[PDB]
């Protein structure tokens, strides 16, 4: 069934602009000659995304000389920049290079962000400690949609309603959730049988792992 | 000087 | 012996895998197709003697090619020195296990062929010949020094002895008692042929070769140095290599100390390469520190340097984690909720009031004690 | 890397041994790729400038310079050789042979003490010196 | 700083005079008896007090 | 009314084994006298703390005899690289005032 | 000049060149009387070896290629990992190389919310503590002055 409740609620349409790349270990003349091969150009691989996988920037390693904490801080719009349309994130499989440009074409009623924390390095798995600075009451995605696409959706203002947060080391980690209780305005943190009343301001401080936003 | 040894090491490894 | 024969039978029947599809290439057909080989019909004893002679000649050629004239090989394939060996000569005489294994194989062939020629001369009876073959195939380890050069061969030897225990105690029933007259050499001959099947490719590869014609950080540092100095102007790299090495060491030290590292005059490509190198070395450093701590805590044998280094690494890692924990406390605020804290405070004040506890005053200036 | 100076022929070696009169000449016979040589050369670079006053270190490739293989019994993957005023100094490490280290110690202080003892014994006049440690047992527990 | 080249000059050429104050600072006349002594025969204090 | 069977916790046994290992590794060039003094102090602390539990715990007794054999071994190897078959125990257990190491014993040693 | 020109006397057999199996590496007949007949013999024997390897050549080579491809994909050599930065490092002017020095030399503040919550908890604890009457406290300055006066 092409249209289920899961697809009707969470699935959206996104336009993948896959641009193949020549091998970097080639002369510049051959590099530009491969631009006429009609293989290393943007393609139309537009598909459906059930969730958005946001990739955090790597940890700053050395702490900044400023008085700020060693914990890195990145705004929500900065990680939500691979889907702006012009940003070109490198994709390199075995003996091949790409430039996967992403452009959203249909915004689902409930948007799912899957922030990438745990990455497998050469020896173990490291959890990215970057803190995402996101608002919890107004996010406008109109700038991430094509002009012919922006006209279709009247509403693009998203409110965060769910926030799954992972705490601790990658192995002995724990999962908690911040849920927005409608009817009221209270925000509640649930961890197993523990239900606490969290303040709306403190949600952005924790390491957001998964996020559910409502389009209104 | 250092590069001469680096090339020998890379070739042999 | 029965139990071990059953053990090896079961092991063969269980470790057995179906044979894999081939293209059916036959070695001897290819040999006949070339000009270097010719076919004839010969007695088995004659070809046994000829093979023994050819093996002796080929071993002589291999010995003399190394100019090791101080080692003499007899016709029974027993290699012995003729003089006290110099250390240089002793190292030159290290032929490896392959040469000795081939020599002992040729010695076993010499034994079998010599027993057969002894029977053919008429000195011994055919029963004596069969019994001698049984003894040879049951006492390869004693008659021939094979086990030292290939340890696995020892297993085969036990097989043969087990097979002897299987045959003798059935052969020696009734009127026949213990004696040297039992000739039944199918089992040991089978076992040694099956060993030869396995070891033929190894000796062929050795002869073809002989007749032809932990420290991840150091390697990481060397490789990044090679990569940087390749992309380096020739006329400037005299001292810039040392400067960038000093920069690499400083960056590693700065990461080890949780202090900012930002060289102003360093170009951003070299800076990014240094950052990547520090990241990789730090990942390896953390992983090897954790692995060494697990090894030491488990009880593995370690020297002082390892423990000292591990302690240092762990110290750095634990202070990194403690700084992270302090910053997390500062960011996420107090972990105790306000109402939780006031509940604890009310509990404490109720306890102390119930105890009628008088608070301890500031150390009095005229304190008697 | 290997910032320590290298000798590319026997001539470089045999005037390097005679170049130093008040400093102990240290020669590492081996191969850079050899890991054990890598450990020793890292240790030497860690102390290359610490012993600049009374010692000097040179790296010699066995393949590049194979003339000393027979005379110095250079059959190990790596050896360390100590000279002073054209005379070799034997060190009694307790390993059986006193002519060459033949192993890579991770602690740089052990090598510093070894070279200091060699210098003290060479300036005093003894051709054979005693290591201030026993290396027969690895001291691992 | 590089480690200075080890050397063994003459330990002392003359004595008396200031030399004595030198030792007085470090190496002054201690008890020099019954402190570095072991008393081969008997035991002081407890057996294995250490 | 009840019997309270005592034992030494495996954590304490591991601490004692680690202390013995530290004594063995931190020996290096130190005099045998100080090594034996450290072993004696460790043994005295263990026994004066776990008096009855040491007797009750068989695994602990095996651990102590193994560690004692290690300490003596260390001294022996220091004396000579070759293994001294039937080494005399008199050198170990003789009190320091009489020239020996003054080593305490917890295993069954037959002179 | 040989090694004896130093006037020294001794007081590939290297362990590296020796392997317990196959003995010492290196063919004993690397050089010798090589002519057209020797080349023909070597070609014939190499052809025989290739024919023998033809038994499982296709599947063996396929498995070898797959295994090496997966090994390289899973674990990349450090030179492969740093090749990207090495090539991105080429774009640098020679003037900047001389400029390399030595080692001789919106956004939300995370501290403010923590300080605010800490101050709130402190205020609550002080409000609760005001009900406690038995607490004792001395005047720091006053006590000190007395200490001052007490100095003989
Ligand atoms: O010469 P060994 O390798 O020690 O073998 C002998 C021998 O067997 P061989 O004839 O194969 O040499 C005897 O055999 P008999 O001549 O007496 O038949 C006898 O074997 P039995 O007494 O079992 O017949 C003996 O045994 P033991 O060592 O128990 O005296 C042992 O044979 P095993 O090595 O098979 O035991």
Brief rundown of the structure:
The structure is cut from a larger assembly and holds one copy of chain A (216 residues), one copy of chain B (13 residues), two copies of chain C, one copy of chain D (141 residues), one copy of chain E (50 residues) and one copy of chain G (152 residues). Chain A is mainly beta.
Structural classification of chain G: mainly alpha
One letter per element, helices H and strands E, the order of chain B comes to H
**Which band does the percent of strand residues of chain B land in?**
under 5%
Helix share bin of chain B: over 70%
Rg of chain G (CA only): 41 Å
Cα-atom radius of gyration of chain B? 6 Å
The total of beta strands of chain G comes to: 2
Subcellular location (chain B): Nucleus; Nucleus speckle
Protein name (chain B): Splicing factor 3A subunit 1
Protein name (chain C): Pre-mRNA-processing-splicing factor 8
Subcellular location (chain C): Nucleus; Nucleus speckle
Report on the architecture of this protein.
This is part of a larger assembly, with one copy of chain A (216 residues), one copy of chain B (13 residues), two copies of chain C, one copy of chain D (141 residues), one copy of chain E (50 residues) and one copy of chain G (152 residues). Chain A is 9% helix and 40% strand. With 216 residues, chain A is mainly beta. In chain A, strand 12 and strand 13 (174-180) form a beta hairpin. Chain A starts with a helix and ends with a strand. In chain D, the strands form two sheets. Chain D has a five-stranded mixed beta sheet. In chain D, helix 2 (35-46) links the parallel strand 2 (24-30) and strand 3. The longest helix of chain D is centred in the C-terminal third of the chain and has 17 residues, at 108-124. Chain E has 50 residues and is an all-alpha fold. The longest helix of chain E has 8 residues, at 18-25. The radius of gyration of chain E is 19 Å and the shape is elongated. Chains C and G meet through helix 2, helix 4, helix 5, helix 9 and helix 10 of C and strand 1, strand 2, helix 1, helix 3 and helix 4 of G. Bound molecules: inositol hexakisphosphate. The site of inositol hexakisphosphate (IHP) has 11 residues of chain C, from helix 6 and helix 8. Inositol hexakisphosphate is lined by residues 135, 138-139, 161, 164-165, 168, 172, 178-180 of chain C. Chain G: This is Pre-mRNA-processing factor 6. Chain G: The modification Phosphothreonine is found at residues 136, 145. Chain G: It is found in: Nucleus, Nucleoplasm; Nucleus speckle. Chain G: It comes from Homo sapiens.
């Amino acid at each position: 069934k092409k249209k289920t409740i899961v697809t009707d609620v969470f699935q959206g349409s996104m336009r993948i602009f896959t641009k193949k790349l020549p091998h970097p270990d080639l002369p510049a003349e051959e590099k530009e000659q491969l631009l006429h091969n009609d293989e290393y150009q943007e393609t139309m691989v537009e598909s459906t995304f059930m969730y958005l996988t946001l990739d955090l920037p790597t940890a700053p390693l050395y702490k900044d000389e400023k008085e700020q904490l060693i914990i890195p801080q990145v705004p929500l719009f900065n990680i939500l920049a691979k889907f702006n349309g012009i940003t070109e994130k490198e994709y390199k499989t075995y003996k091949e290079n790409f430039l996967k440009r992403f452009q959203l074409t249909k915004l689902p009623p409930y948007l799912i962000f899957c922030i990438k924390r745990f990455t497998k390095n050469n020896f173990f798995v490291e959890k990215n400690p970057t803190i995402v600075n996101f608002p919890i009451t107004n996010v406008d995605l109109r700038e991430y949609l094509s002009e012919e696409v922006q006209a279709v959706h009247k509403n693009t203002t998203y409110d965060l309603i769910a926030n799954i947060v992972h705490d601790g080391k990658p192995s002995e980690g724990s999962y908690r959730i911040h849920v927005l209780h409608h009817g009221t305005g209270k925000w509640y943190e649930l961890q197993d049988l523990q239900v606490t009343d969290i303040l709306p301001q403190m949600i952005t401080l924790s390491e957001a792992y998964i996020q559910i936003w409502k389009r209104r | 000087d250092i590069e001469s040894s680096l090339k020998q090491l890379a070739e042999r490894r | 012996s029965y139990q071990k024969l059953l053990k090896y039978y079961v092991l063969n029947a269980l470790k057995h895998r179906p044979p894999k599809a081939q293209k059916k290439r036959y070695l001897f057909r290819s040999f006949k197709a070339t000009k270097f080989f010719q076919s004839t019909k010969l007695d088995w004893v004659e070809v046994g003697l000829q093979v023994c002679r050819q093996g002796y000649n080929m071993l002589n050629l291999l010995i003399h090619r190394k100019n090791l004239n101080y080692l003499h090989l007899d016709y029974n394939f027993n290699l012995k020195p003729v003089k006290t060996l110099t250390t240089k000569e002793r190292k030159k005489s290290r032929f490896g296990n392959a040469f000795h294994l081939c020599r002992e194989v040729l010695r076993l062939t010499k034994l079998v062929v010599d027993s057969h020629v002894q029977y053919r001369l008429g000195n011994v009876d055919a029963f004596q010949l069969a019994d001698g073959l049984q003894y040879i195939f049951a006492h390869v380890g004693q008659l021939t020094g094979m086990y030292r050069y290939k340890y696995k061969l020892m297993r085969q030897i036990r097989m043969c002895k087990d097979l002897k225990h299987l045959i003798y105690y059935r052969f020696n029933t009734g009127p026949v008692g213990k004696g040297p007259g039992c000739g039944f050499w199918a089992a040991g001959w089978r076992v040694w042929l099956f060993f030869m099947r396995g070891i033929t490719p190894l000796l062929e590869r050795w002869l073809g070769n002989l007749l032809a014609r932990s420290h991840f950080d150091l390697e990481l540092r060397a490789a990044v140095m090679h990569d940087i100095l390749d992309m380096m102007p020739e006329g400037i790299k005299q001292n810039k290599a040392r400067t960038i090495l000093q920069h690499l060491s400083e960056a590693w030290r700065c990461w080890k100390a949780n202090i900012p590292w930002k060289v102003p005059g360093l170009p951003t490509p070299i800076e990014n390469m240094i950052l990547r190198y520090v990241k990789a070395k730090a990942d390896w450093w953390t992983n090897t520190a954790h692995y060494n701590r697990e090894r030491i805590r488990r009880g593995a044998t370690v020297d002082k340097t390892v423990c000292k280094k591990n302690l240092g690494r762990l110290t750095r890692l634990y202070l990194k984690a403690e700084q992270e924990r302090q910053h997390n406390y500062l960011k996420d605020g107090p972990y105790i909720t306000a109402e939780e804290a006031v509940a604890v405070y009310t509990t404490t004040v109720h306890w102390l009031e119930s105890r009628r506890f008088s608070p301890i005053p500031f150390p009095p200036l005229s304190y008697k004690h | 890397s290997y910032m320590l100076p290298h000798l590319h022929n026997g001539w470089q070696v045999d005037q390097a041994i005679l170049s130093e009169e008040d400093r102990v000449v240290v020669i590492r016979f081996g191969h850079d790729w050899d890991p054990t040589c890598m450990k020793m050369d890292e240790v030497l670079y860690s102390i290359a400038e610490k012993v600049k006053n009374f010692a000097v270190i040179y790296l010699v490739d066995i393949t590049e310079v194979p003339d000393f293989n027979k005379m110095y019994e250079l059959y190990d993957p790596c050896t360390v050789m100590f000279f002073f005023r054209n005379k070799h100094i034997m060190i009694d490490l307790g390993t059986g042979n006193n002519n060459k280290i033949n192993w890579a110690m991770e602690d740089k202080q052990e090598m510093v003490d070894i070279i200091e003892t060699v210098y003290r014994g060479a300036r005093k006049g003894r051709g054979l010196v005693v290591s201030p440690k026993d290396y027969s047992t690895k001291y691992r527990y | 700083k590089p480690l200075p080249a080890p050397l063994d000059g003459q330990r002392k050429k003359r004595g008396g005079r200031r030399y004595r104050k030198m030792k007085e600072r470090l190496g002054l006349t201690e008890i020099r008896k019954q402190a570095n002594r072991m008393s081969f025969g008997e035991i002081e204090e407890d057996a294995y007090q250490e | 009314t009840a019997q309270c069977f005592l034992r030494v916790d495996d954590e304490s046994m591991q601490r004692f084994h680690n202390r013995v290992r530290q004594i063995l590794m931190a020996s290096g060039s130190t005099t045998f006298t100080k090594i034996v003094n450290k072993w004696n102090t460790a043994l005295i602390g263990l026994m004066t703390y776990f008096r009855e539990a040491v007797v009750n715990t068989q695994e602990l007794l095996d651990l102590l005899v193994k560690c004692e054999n290690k300490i003596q071994t260390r001294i022996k190897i220091g004396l000579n690289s070759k293994m001294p078959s039937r080494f005399p125990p008199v050198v170990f257990y003789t009190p320091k005032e009489l020239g020996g190491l003054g080593m305490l014993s917890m295993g069954h040693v037959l002179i | 000049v040989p090694g004896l020109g130093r006037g020294a006397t001794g007081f590939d057999l290297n362990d590296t060149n020796y392997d317990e199996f196959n003995g010492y590496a290196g063919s004993l007949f690397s050089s010798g009387p090589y002519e057209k007949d020797d080349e023909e013999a070597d070609a014939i024997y190499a052809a025989l070896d290739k024919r023998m390897d033809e038994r499982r050549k296709e599947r063996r080579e396929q498995r070898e290629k797959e295994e090496i491809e997966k090994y390289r994909m899973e674990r990349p050599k450090i030179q492969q990992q740093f090749s990207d930065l090495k090539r991105k490092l080429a774009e640098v002017t020679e003037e900047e190389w001389l400029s390399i020095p030595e080692v001789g030399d919106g956004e939300l503040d995370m501290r403010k919310i923590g300080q605010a919550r800490n101050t709130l908890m402190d205020m609550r604890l002080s409000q609760v503590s005001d009900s406690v009457s038995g607490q004792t406290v001395v005047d720091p300055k006053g006590y000190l002055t007395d200490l001052n006066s007490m100095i003989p």
